[PDB]
Amino acid sequence: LPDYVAWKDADALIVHSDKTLETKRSEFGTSIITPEEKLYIRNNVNTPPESILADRDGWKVEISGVKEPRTLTVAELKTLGLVTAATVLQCSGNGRKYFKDQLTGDQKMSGTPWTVGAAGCVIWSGVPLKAVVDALGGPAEGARFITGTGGEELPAGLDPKLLVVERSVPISNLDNVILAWEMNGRPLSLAHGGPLRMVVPGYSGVNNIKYVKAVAMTEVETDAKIQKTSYRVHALGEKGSPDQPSVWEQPVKSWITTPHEAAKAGQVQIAGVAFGGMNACKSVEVSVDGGQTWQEAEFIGPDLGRFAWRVFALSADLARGTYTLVSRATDTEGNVQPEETEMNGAGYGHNGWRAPAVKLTVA
Amino acid sequence: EDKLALGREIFLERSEPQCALCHTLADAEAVGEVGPNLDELKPDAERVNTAVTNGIGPMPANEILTDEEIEAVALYVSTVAGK
Ligand code: HEC
Ligand code: MSS
């Protein structure tokens, strides 16, 4: 494992690269919450040093686009409010392997071949952005986005807007947005963007700015590369452009996580995780024969809110053989996972129920 | 056998921006820390080639570089990654 994540669980993680660590499917557990030392890692650029955690409460955050712009410290943010929320953190790339599986002939695609482990469910704690904005007089008239900026010190000798991690989402999110300083009951880790993190519930990982150093209410999206042309949904062979949809709201998804490989004939408890992105998951069906037959599954554990995943489970009674385990989720507004997700050039947002099927040898 | 040194030139000098500025590759004494350390990625030639052609994140779709060059850099990287 790489040093800045030396504390993580080497056995629980696939090391695609030093910037890129995926959780093994067997490691999610059945508690909803993803063990911090097993949560995935995805970094677009270089990583800050530990020294920025020396003084967590002195970390500064420039808040502009409000009737009273100010730089605030984490110390002051702690005074303004408190909020806690469970959300699913999941990269837009999660599932890219499954898009690569469908490429025919010359068709080629780059990116980390994530399967399902670039996703976790965590409990964030910190101050809500609405509180922080109302503290500062409200947002400037005609603000249309929340725009946050990563704190990484960019290496000299390249154009900042090519590498800065600066994302914009709609101001309709203000009510849900959180500047968290705490994850799963602990001071936020360096790996996961401590000492402070913009958290945009229901949205892809890219929008949750690690080490956020500025947060602006803007009339326009940021022109940073990472917003203008990256993280955009386009057809194969197209280039990304700001008229295309960006990776914002997460769509309804689920996968099977247990059993992952082998099982004795008889009763077998099949479980996994499901969520509706911006909406709560309403129901889930499981199939053991890879689509031909569906049964309604059961929710397991408590409901941590609309942006969290549920654990579900099915008790099946199985004869010896090779099964094909798949899950299909419906959210509260009636959106179902498709069998397979329409292709896109970059490979974002895979949410098909067939691709991530588990193969189970019942012996 | 010969087209390697071309890839290495492409990697350290000829590319705009230079790969070494973003990437770490032991063989090239490159220590770029923005994109993946390529020794850890240990990518095949096909992976390199597609990345540089199609673009990925801050790498844009290639436009100022010909194919003999791309394949050269794809050959060099894939070969030396983690030697
Ligand atoms: C800074 C502008 C960079 C330049 C110059 C080069 N690379 Fe790059 N590269 C960079 C980043 C931040 C990433 C990761 C992006 C992501 O979304 O994961 C990459 C990625 C690659 C890869 C992996 C491709 C894949 O399929 O995942 C390769 C093989 C690669 N880069 C090669 C490469 C070459 C050959 C370059 C010179 C022609 C080059 N990169 C320049 C950042 C930057
Ligand atoms: N600052 C910053 N932030 C940030 C980054 C970087 O690189 N930087 N990344 C992204 C992404 S992109 Mo895709 O959509 S996913 C993601 C996430 C992840 O997280 P973790 O690592 O903690 O897991 O984050 C986010 N944020």
Side-chain angles (χ1 to χ4, degrees), chain A residues 233-238 240-266:
Chain A
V233 178
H234 47 87
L236 270 160
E238 300 194 313
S241 75
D243 54 330
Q244 299 156 355
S246 194
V247 303
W248 282 348
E249 307 191 354
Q250 281 177 326
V252 50
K253 201 175 173 183
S254 69
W255 49 95
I256 302 277
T257 60
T258 174
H260 79 272
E261 175 191 316
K264 277 204 203 68

PDB file of all heavy atoms in Angstrom, chain A residues 233-266, unseen atoms left out:
ATOM      1  N   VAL A 233     -20.986  13.390 -19.661  1.00  0.00           N
ATOM      2  CA  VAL A 233     -21.558  12.211 -20.349  1.00  0.00           C
ATOM      3  C   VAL A 233     -21.706  12.410 -21.872  1.00  0.00           C
ATOM      4  O   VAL A 233     -22.577  13.161 -22.356  1.00  0.00           O
ATOM      5  CB  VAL A 233     -22.953  11.827 -19.785  1.00  0.00           C
ATOM      6  CG1 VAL A 233     -23.533  10.641 -20.562  1.00  0.00           C
ATOM      7  CG2 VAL A 233     -22.893  11.547 -18.261  1.00  0.00           C
ATOM      8  N   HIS A 234     -20.882  11.697 -22.631  1.00  0.00           N
ATOM      9  CA  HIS A 234     -20.928  11.772 -24.082  1.00  0.00           C
ATOM     10  C   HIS A 234     -20.870  10.396 -24.754  1.00  0.00           C
ATOM     11  O   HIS A 234     -20.618   9.383 -24.113  1.00  0.00           O
ATOM     12  CB  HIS A 234     -19.796  12.650 -24.564  1.00  0.00           C
ATOM     13  CG  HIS A 234     -18.481  12.336 -23.935  1.00  0.00           C
ATOM     14  ND1 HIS A 234     -17.628  11.377 -24.433  1.00  0.00           N
ATOM     15  CD2 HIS A 234     -17.873  12.851 -22.845  1.00  0.00           C
ATOM     16  CE1 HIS A 234     -16.544  11.322 -23.681  1.00  0.00           C
ATOM     17  NE2 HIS A 234     -16.667  12.210 -22.713  1.00  0.00           N
ATOM     18  N   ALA A 235     -21.135  10.370 -26.054  1.00  0.00           N
ATOM     19  CA  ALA A 235     -21.130   9.130 -26.819  1.00  0.00           C
ATOM     20  C   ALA A 235     -19.683   8.701 -27.102  1.00  0.00           C
ATOM     21  O   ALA A 235     -18.757   9.502 -26.968  1.00  0.00           O
ATOM     22  CB  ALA A 235     -21.907   9.307 -28.100  1.00  0.00           C
ATOM     23  N   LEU A 236     -19.484   7.424 -27.443  1.00  0.00           N
ATOM     24  CA  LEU A 236     -18.138   6.919 -27.754  1.00  0.00           C
ATOM     25  C   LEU A 236     -17.597   7.712 -28.928  1.00  0.00           C
ATOM     26  O   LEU A 236     -18.341   8.021 -29.872  1.00  0.00           O
ATOM     27  CB  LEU A 236     -18.155   5.437 -28.143  1.00  0.00           C
ATOM     28  CG  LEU A 236     -18.005   4.390 -27.052  1.00  0.00           C
ATOM     29  CD1 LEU A 236     -18.527   3.070 -27.570  1.00  0.00           C
ATOM     30  CD2 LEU A 236     -16.551   4.272 -26.612  1.00  0.00           C
ATOM     31  N   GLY A 237     -16.318   8.058 -28.857  1.00  0.00           N
ATOM     32  CA  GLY A 237     -15.695   8.822 -29.907  1.00  0.00           C
ATOM     33  C   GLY A 237     -15.935  10.313 -29.829  1.00  0.00           C
ATOM     34  O   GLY A 237     -15.306  11.054 -30.579  1.00  0.00           O
ATOM     35  N   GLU A 238     -16.836  10.760 -28.950  1.00  0.00           N
ATOM     36  CA  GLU A 238     -17.025  12.192 -28.689  1.00  0.00           C
ATOM     37  C   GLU A 238     -16.014  12.691 -27.664  1.00  0.00           C
ATOM     38  O   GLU A 238     -15.398  11.919 -26.937  1.00  0.00           O
ATOM     39  CB  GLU A 238     -18.438  12.512 -28.202  1.00  0.00           C
ATOM     40  CG  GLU A 238     -19.544  12.147 -29.165  1.00  0.00           C
ATOM     41  CD  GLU A 238     -20.892  12.771 -28.803  1.00  0.00           C
ATOM     42  OE1 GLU A 238     -21.311  12.718 -27.627  1.00  0.00           O
ATOM     43  OE2 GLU A 238     -21.556  13.314 -29.710  1.00  0.00           O
ATOM     44  N   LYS A 239     -15.833  13.999 -27.644  1.00  0.00           N
ATOM     45  CA  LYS A 239     -14.994  14.651 -26.667  1.00  0.00           C
ATOM     46  C   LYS A 239     -15.969  15.314 -25.695  1.00  0.00           C
ATOM     47  O   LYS A 239     -17.089  15.637 -26.085  1.00  0.00           O
ATOM     48  CB  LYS A 239     -14.068  15.673 -27.359  1.00  0.00           C
ATOM     49  N   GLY A 240     -15.563  15.487 -24.438  1.00  0.00           N
ATOM     50  CA  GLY A 240     -16.397  16.152 -23.435  1.00  0.00           C
ATOM     51  C   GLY A 240     -16.548  17.648 -23.686  1.00  0.00           C
ATOM     52  O   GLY A 240     -15.592  18.321 -24.046  1.00  0.00           O
ATOM     53  N   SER A 241     -17.756  18.165 -23.494  1.00  0.00           N
ATOM     54  CA  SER A 241     -18.026  19.587 -23.662  1.00  0.00           C
ATOM     55  C   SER A 241     -19.160  20.059 -22.741  1.00  0.00           C
ATOM     56  O   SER A 241     -20.085  19.292 -22.460  1.00  0.00           O
ATOM     57  CB  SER A 241     -18.379  19.898 -25.119  1.00  0.00           C
ATOM     58  OG  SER A 241     -19.682  19.463 -25.414  1.00  0.00           O
ATOM     59  N   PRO A 242     -19.120  21.344 -22.317  1.00  0.00           N
ATOM     60  CA  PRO A 242     -20.011  21.850 -21.278  1.00  0.00           C
ATOM     61  C   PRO A 242     -21.501  21.904 -21.640  1.00  0.00           C
ATOM     62  O   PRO A 242     -22.313  22.290 -20.785  1.00  0.00           O
ATOM     63  CB  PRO A 242     -19.482  23.266 -21.040  1.00  0.00           C
ATOM     64  CG  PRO A 242     -18.961  23.676 -22.324  1.00  0.00           C
ATOM     65  CD  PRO A 242     -18.311  22.442 -22.883  1.00  0.00           C
ATOM     66  N   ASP A 243     -21.869  21.535 -22.869  1.00  0.00           N
ATOM     67  CA  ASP A 243     -23.303  21.333 -23.190  1.00  0.00           C
ATOM     68  C   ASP A 243     -23.778  19.934 -22.820  1.00  0.00           C
ATOM     69  O   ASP A 243     -24.977  19.710 -22.715  1.00  0.00           O
ATOM     70  CB  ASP A 243     -23.640  21.618 -24.668  1.00  0.00           C
ATOM     71  CG  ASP A 243     -22.771  20.838 -25.645  1.00  0.00           C
ATOM     72  OD1 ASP A 243     -21.598  20.519 -25.337  1.00  0.00           O
ATOM     73  OD2 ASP A 243     -23.260  20.553 -26.749  1.00  0.00           O
ATOM     74  N   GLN A 244     -22.853  18.999 -22.623  1.00  0.00           N
ATOM     75  CA  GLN A 244     -23.223  17.638 -22.248  1.00  0.00           C
ATOM     76  C   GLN A 244     -23.577  17.574 -20.751  1.00  0.00           C
ATOM     77  O   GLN A 244     -23.160  18.438 -19.963  1.00  0.00           O
ATOM     78  CB  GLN A 244     -22.076  16.673 -22.572  1.00  0.00           C
ATOM     79  CG  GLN A 244     -21.720  16.639 -24.044  1.00  0.00           C
ATOM     80  CD  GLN A 244     -20.301  16.189 -24.319  1.00  0.00           C
ATOM     81  OE1 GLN A 244     -19.519  15.983 -23.401  1.00  0.00           O
ATOM     82  NE2 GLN A 244     -19.956  16.045 -25.607  1.00  0.00           N
ATOM     83  N   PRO A 245     -24.357  16.555 -20.339  1.00  0.00           N
ATOM     84  CA  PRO A 245     -24.640  16.476 -18.919  1.00  0.00           C
ATOM     85  C   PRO A 245     -23.379  16.196 -18.148  1.00  0.00           C
ATOM     86  O   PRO A 245     -22.505  15.477 -18.631  1.00  0.00           O
ATOM     87  CB  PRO A 245     -25.608  15.286 -18.800  1.00  0.00           C
ATOM     88  CG  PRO A 245     -26.106  15.022 -20.155  1.00  0.00           C
ATOM     89  CD  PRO A 245     -25.034  15.485 -21.091  1.00  0.00           C
ATOM     90  N   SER A 246     -23.289  16.782 -16.964  1.00  0.00           N
ATOM     91  CA  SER A 246     -22.197  16.505 -16.053  1.00  0.00           C
ATOM     92  C   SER A 246     -22.636  15.426 -15.068  1.00  0.00           C
ATOM     93  O   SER A 246     -23.834  15.160 -14.914  1.00  0.00           O
ATOM     94  CB  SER A 246     -21.793  17.766 -15.303  1.00  0.00           C
ATOM     95  OG  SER A 246     -20.535  17.580 -14.666  1.00  0.00           O
ATOM     96  N   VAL A 247     -21.650  14.811 -14.420  1.00  0.00           N
ATOM     97  CA  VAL A 247     -21.891  13.791 -13.436  1.00  0.00           C
ATOM     98  C   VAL A 247     -22.317  14.467 -12.138  1.00  0.00           C
ATOM     99  O   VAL A 247     -21.489  14.803 -11.281  1.00  0.00           O
ATOM    100  CB  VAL A 247     -20.672  12.866 -13.240  1.00  0.00           C
ATOM    101  CG1 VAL A 247     -20.296  12.233 -14.557  1.00  0.00           C
ATOM    102  CG2 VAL A 247     -19.481  13.609 -12.673  1.00  0.00           C
ATOM    103  N   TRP A 248     -23.639  14.651 -12.024  1.00  0.00           N
ATOM    104  CA  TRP A 248     -24.276  15.201 -10.859  1.00  0.00           C
ATOM    105  C   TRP A 248     -25.049  14.144 -10.051  1.00  0.00           C
ATOM    106  O   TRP A 248     -24.411  13.290  -9.432  1.00  0.00           O
ATOM    107  CB  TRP A 248     -25.161  16.371 -11.305  1.00  0.00           C
ATOM    108  CG  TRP A 248     -24.349  17.595 -11.561  1.00  0.00           C
ATOM    109  CD1 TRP A 248     -23.029  17.796 -11.227  1.00  0.00           C
ATOM    110  CD2 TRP A 248     -24.795  18.802 -12.161  1.00  0.00           C
ATOM    111  NE1 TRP A 248     -22.636  19.042 -11.597  1.00  0.00           N
ATOM    112  CE2 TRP A 248     -23.690  19.686 -12.186  1.00  0.00           C
ATOM    113  CE3 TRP A 248     -26.006  19.214 -12.716  1.00  0.00           C
ATOM    114  CZ2 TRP A 248     -23.763  20.973 -12.739  1.00  0.00           C
ATOM    115  CZ3 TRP A 248     -26.092  20.494 -13.264  1.00  0.00           C
ATOM    116  CH2 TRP A 248     -24.979  21.364 -13.266  1.00  0.00           C
ATOM    117  N   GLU A 249     -26.389  14.199 -10.063  1.00  0.00           N
ATOM    118  CA  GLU A 249     -27.223  13.242  -9.352  1.00  0.00           C
ATOM    119  C   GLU A 249     -26.849  11.815  -9.705  1.00  0.00           C
ATOM    120  O   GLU A 249     -26.778  11.470 -10.883  1.00  0.00           O
ATOM    121  CB  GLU A 249     -28.713  13.414  -9.680  1.00  0.00           C
ATOM    122  CG  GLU A 249     -29.255  14.808  -9.509  1.00  0.00           C
ATOM    123  CD  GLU A 249     -30.760  14.860  -9.580  1.00  0.00           C
ATOM    124  OE1 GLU A 249     -31.373  13.819  -9.885  1.00  0.00           O
ATOM    125  OE2 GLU A 249     -31.348  15.926  -9.322  1.00  0.00           O
ATOM    126  N   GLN A 250     -26.627  10.989  -8.672  1.00  0.00           N
ATOM    127  CA  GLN A 250     -26.443   9.519  -8.810  1.00  0.00           C
ATOM    128  C   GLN A 250     -27.768   8.840  -9.128  1.00  0.00           C
ATOM    129  O   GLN A 250     -28.815   9.207  -8.560  1.00  0.00           O
ATOM    130  CB  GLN A 250     -25.934   8.905  -7.511  1.00  0.00           C
ATOM    131  CG  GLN A 250     -24.452   9.092  -7.295  1.00  0.00           C
ATOM    132  CD  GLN A 250     -23.970   8.542  -5.966  1.00  0.00           C
ATOM    133  OE1 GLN A 250     -24.677   8.580  -4.962  1.00  0.00           O
ATOM    134  NE2 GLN A 250     -22.736   8.060  -5.953  1.00  0.00           N
ATOM    135  N   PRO A 251     -27.734   7.835 -10.026  1.00  0.00           N
ATOM    136  CA  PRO A 251     -28.932   7.064 -10.361  1.00  0.00           C
ATOM    137  C   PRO A 251     -29.070   5.820  -9.469  1.00  0.00           C
ATOM    138  O   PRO A 251     -28.098   5.385  -8.818  1.00  0.00           O
ATOM    139  CB  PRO A 251     -28.648   6.623 -11.789  1.00  0.00           C
ATOM    140  CG  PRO A 251     -27.152   6.338 -11.761  1.00  0.00           C
ATOM    141  CD  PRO A 251     -26.561   7.371 -10.799  1.00  0.00           C
ATOM    142  N   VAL A 252     -30.259   5.237  -9.506  1.00  0.00           N
ATOM    143  CA  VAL A 252     -30.592   4.057  -8.716  1.00  0.00           C
ATOM    144  C   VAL A 252     -29.671   2.889  -9.044  1.00  0.00           C
ATOM    145  O   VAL A 252     -29.409   2.596 -10.210  1.00  0.00           O
ATOM    146  CB  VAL A 252     -32.076   3.643  -8.925  1.00  0.00           C
ATOM    147  CG1 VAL A 252     -32.402   3.554 -10.394  1.00  0.00           C
ATOM    148  CG2 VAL A 252     -32.372   2.329  -8.234  1.00  0.00           C
ATOM    149  N   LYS A 253     -29.188   2.232  -8.000  1.00  0.00           N
ATOM    150  CA  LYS A 253     -28.184   1.207  -8.163  1.00  0.00           C
ATOM    151  C   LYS A 253     -28.240   0.188  -7.011  1.00  0.00           C
ATOM    152  O   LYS A 253     -28.849   0.428  -5.970  1.00  0.00           O
ATOM    153  CB  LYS A 253     -26.809   1.874  -8.259  1.00  0.00           C
ATOM    154  CG  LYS A 253     -25.729   1.039  -8.900  1.00  0.00           C
ATOM    155  CD  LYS A 253     -24.417   1.803  -9.090  1.00  0.00           C
ATOM    156  CE  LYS A 253     -23.323   0.894  -9.584  1.00  0.00           C
ATOM    157  NZ  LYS A 253     -21.995   1.559  -9.718  1.00  0.00           N
ATOM    158  N   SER A 254     -27.631  -0.968  -7.229  1.00  0.00           N
ATOM    159  CA  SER A 254     -27.453  -1.965  -6.183  1.00  0.00           C
ATOM    160  C   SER A 254     -26.482  -3.020  -6.665  1.00  0.00           C
ATOM    161  O   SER A 254     -26.294  -3.187  -7.854  1.00  0.00           O
ATOM    162  CB  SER A 254     -28.791  -2.646  -5.863  1.00  0.00           C
ATOM    163  OG  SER A 254     -29.209  -3.462  -6.933  1.00  0.00           O
ATOM    164  N   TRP A 255     -25.864  -3.743  -5.759  1.00  0.00           N
ATOM    165  CA  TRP A 255     -25.214  -4.964  -6.170  1.00  0.00           C
ATOM    166  C   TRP A 255     -25.255  -5.984  -5.074  1.00  0.00           C
ATOM    167  O   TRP A 255     -25.544  -5.644  -3.931  1.00  0.00           O
ATOM    168  CB  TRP A 255     -23.791  -4.709  -6.607  1.00  0.00           C
ATOM    169  CG  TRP A 255     -23.006  -3.902  -5.693  1.00  0.00           C
ATOM    170  CD1 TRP A 255     -22.168  -4.350  -4.721  1.00  0.00           C
ATOM    171  CD2 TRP A 255     -22.926  -2.475  -5.676  1.00  0.00           C
ATOM    172  NE1 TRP A 255     -21.568  -3.280  -4.083  1.00  0.00           N
ATOM    173  CE2 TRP A 255     -22.017  -2.118  -4.657  1.00  0.00           C
ATOM    174  CE3 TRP A 255     -23.525  -1.459  -6.431  1.00  0.00           C
ATOM    175  CZ2 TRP A 255     -21.696  -0.784  -4.371  1.00  0.00           C
ATOM    176  CZ3 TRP A 255     -23.217  -0.131  -6.129  1.00  0.00           C
ATOM    177  CH2 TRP A 255     -22.308   0.188  -5.112  1.00  0.00           C
ATOM    178  N   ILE A 256     -24.991  -7.235  -5.438  1.00  0.00           N
ATOM    179  CA  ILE A 256     -24.884  -8.288  -4.460  1.00  0.00           C
ATOM    180  C   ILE A 256     -23.448  -8.265  -3.922  1.00  0.00           C
ATOM    181  O   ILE A 256     -22.495  -8.072  -4.676  1.00  0.00           O
ATOM    182  CB  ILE A 256     -25.280  -9.666  -5.054  1.00  0.00           C
ATOM    183  CG1 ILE A 256     -26.718  -9.623  -5.611  1.00  0.00           C
ATOM    184  CG2 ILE A 256     -25.173 -10.758  -4.004  1.00  0.00           C
ATOM    185  CD1 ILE A 256     -27.849  -9.838  -4.569  1.00  0.00           C
ATOM    186  N   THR A 257     -23.320  -8.427  -2.605  1.00  0.00           N
ATOM    187  CA  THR A 257     -22.037  -8.395  -1.914  1.00  0.00           C
ATOM    188  C   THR A 257     -21.730  -9.680  -1.164  1.00  0.00           C
ATOM    189  O   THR A 257     -20.553  -9.955  -0.878  1.00  0.00           O
ATOM    190  CB  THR A 257     -22.035  -7.299  -0.875  1.00  0.00           C
ATOM    191  OG1 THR A 257     -23.084  -7.562   0.066  1.00  0.00           O
ATOM    192  CG2 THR A 257     -22.263  -5.948  -1.526  1.00  0.00           C
ATOM    193  N   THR A 258     -22.779 -10.433  -0.806  1.00  0.00           N
ATOM    194  CA  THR A 258     -22.622 -11.720  -0.126  1.00  0.00           C
ATOM    195  C   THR A 258     -23.740 -12.698  -0.502  1.00  0.00           C
ATOM    196  O   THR A 258     -24.904 -12.282  -0.650  1.00  0.00           O
ATOM    197  CB  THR A 258     -22.570 -11.541   1.407  1.00  0.00           C
ATOM    198  OG1 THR A 258     -22.555 -12.825   2.042  1.00  0.00           O
ATOM    199  CG2 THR A 258     -23.766 -10.763   1.910  1.00  0.00           C
ATOM    200  N   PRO A 259     -23.403 -13.996  -0.691  1.00  0.00           N
ATOM    201  CA  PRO A 259     -22.082 -14.645  -0.643  1.00  0.00           C
ATOM    202  C   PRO A 259     -21.301 -14.277  -1.870  1.00  0.00           C
ATOM    203  O   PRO A 259     -21.911 -13.983  -2.899  1.00  0.00           O
ATOM    204  CB  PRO A 259     -22.414 -16.133  -0.690  1.00  0.00           C
ATOM    205  CG  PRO A 259     -23.672 -16.195  -1.475  1.00  0.00           C
ATOM    206  CD  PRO A 259     -24.439 -14.933  -1.159  1.00  0.00           C
ATOM    207  N   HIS A 260     -19.977 -14.274  -1.790  1.00  0.00           N
ATOM    208  CA  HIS A 260     -19.220 -13.727  -2.907  1.00  0.00           C
ATOM    209  C   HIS A 260     -18.675 -14.790  -3.858  1.00  0.00           C
ATOM    210  O   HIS A 260     -18.318 -14.461  -4.997  1.00  0.00           O
ATOM    211  CB  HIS A 260     -18.116 -12.776  -2.420  1.00  0.00           C
ATOM    212  CG  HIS A 260     -16.902 -13.468  -1.896  1.00  0.00           C
ATOM    213  ND1 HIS A 260     -16.784 -13.862  -0.579  1.00  0.00           N
ATOM    214  CD2 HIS A 260     -15.745 -13.822  -2.506  1.00  0.00           C
ATOM    215  CE1 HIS A 260     -15.607 -14.441  -0.406  1.00  0.00           C
ATOM    216  NE2 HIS A 260     -14.954 -14.421  -1.558  1.00  0.00           N
ATOM    217  N   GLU A 261     -18.639 -16.053  -3.427  1.00  0.00           N
ATOM    218  CA  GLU A 261     -17.916 -17.071  -4.190  1.00  0.00           C
ATOM    219  C   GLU A 261     -18.509 -18.476  -4.073  1.00  0.00           C
ATOM    220  O   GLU A 261     -18.849 -19.074  -5.092  1.00  0.00           O
ATOM    221  CB  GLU A 261     -16.442 -17.068  -3.755  1.00  0.00           C
ATOM    222  CG  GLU A 261     -15.567 -18.158  -4.362  1.00  0.00           C
ATOM    223  CD  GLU A 261     -14.201 -18.241  -3.680  1.00  0.00           C
ATOM    224  OE1 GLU A 261     -13.586 -17.167  -3.434  1.00  0.00           O
ATOM    225  OE2 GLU A 261     -13.741 -19.377  -3.391  1.00  0.00           O
ATOM    226  N   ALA A 262     -18.587 -19.006  -2.845  1.00  0.00           N
ATOM    227  CA  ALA A 262     -18.950 -20.413  -2.616  1.00  0.00           C
ATOM    228  C   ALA A 262     -19.930 -20.534  -1.452  1.00  0.00           C
ATOM    229  O   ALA A 262     -20.041 -19.616  -0.645  1.00  0.00           O
ATOM    230  CB  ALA A 262     -17.720 -21.244  -2.366  1.00  0.00           C
ATOM    231  N   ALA A 263     -20.650 -21.655  -1.398  1.00  0.00           N
ATOM    232  CA  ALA A 263     -21.775 -21.856  -0.459  1.00  0.00           C
ATOM    233  C   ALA A 263     -22.251 -23.305  -0.450  1.00  0.00           C
ATOM    234  O   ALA A 263     -22.222 -23.966  -1.474  1.00  0.00           O
ATOM    235  CB  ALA A 263     -22.933 -20.960  -0.810  1.00  0.00           C
ATOM    236  N   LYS A 264     -22.695 -23.796   0.698  1.00  0.00           N
ATOM    237  CA  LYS A 264     -23.190 -25.156   0.790  1.00  0.00           C
ATOM    238  C   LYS A 264     -24.639 -25.228   0.325  1.00  0.00           C
ATOM    239  O   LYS A 264     -25.410 -24.266   0.463  1.00  0.00           O
ATOM    240  CB  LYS A 264     -23.079 -25.678   2.227  1.00  0.00           C
ATOM    241  CG  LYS A 264     -21.693 -26.218   2.611  1.00  0.00           C
ATOM    242  CD  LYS A 264     -21.816 -27.212   3.777  1.00  0.00           C
ATOM    243  CE  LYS A 264     -20.519 -27.347   4.570  1.00  0.00           C
ATOM    244  NZ  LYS A 264     -20.204 -26.095   5.319  1.00  0.00           N
ATOM    245  N   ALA A 265     -25.020 -26.371  -0.230  1.00  0.00           N
ATOM    246  CA  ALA A 265     -26.384 -26.527  -0.685  1.00  0.00           C
ATOM    247  C   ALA A 265     -27.302 -26.466   0.516  1.00  0.00           C
ATOM    248  O   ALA A 265     -26.983 -26.980   1.575  1.00  0.00           O
ATOM    249  CB  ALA A 265     -26.551 -27.804  -1.401  1.00  0.00           C
ATOM    250  N   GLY A 266     -28.443 -25.818   0.333  1.00  0.00           N
ATOM    251  CA  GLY A 266     -29.395 -25.604   1.397  1.00  0.00           C
ATOM    252  C   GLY A 266     -29.734 -24.132   1.483  1.00  0.00           C
ATOM    253  O   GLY A 266     -29.766 -23.423   0.472  1.00  0.00           O
TER     254      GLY A 266
END
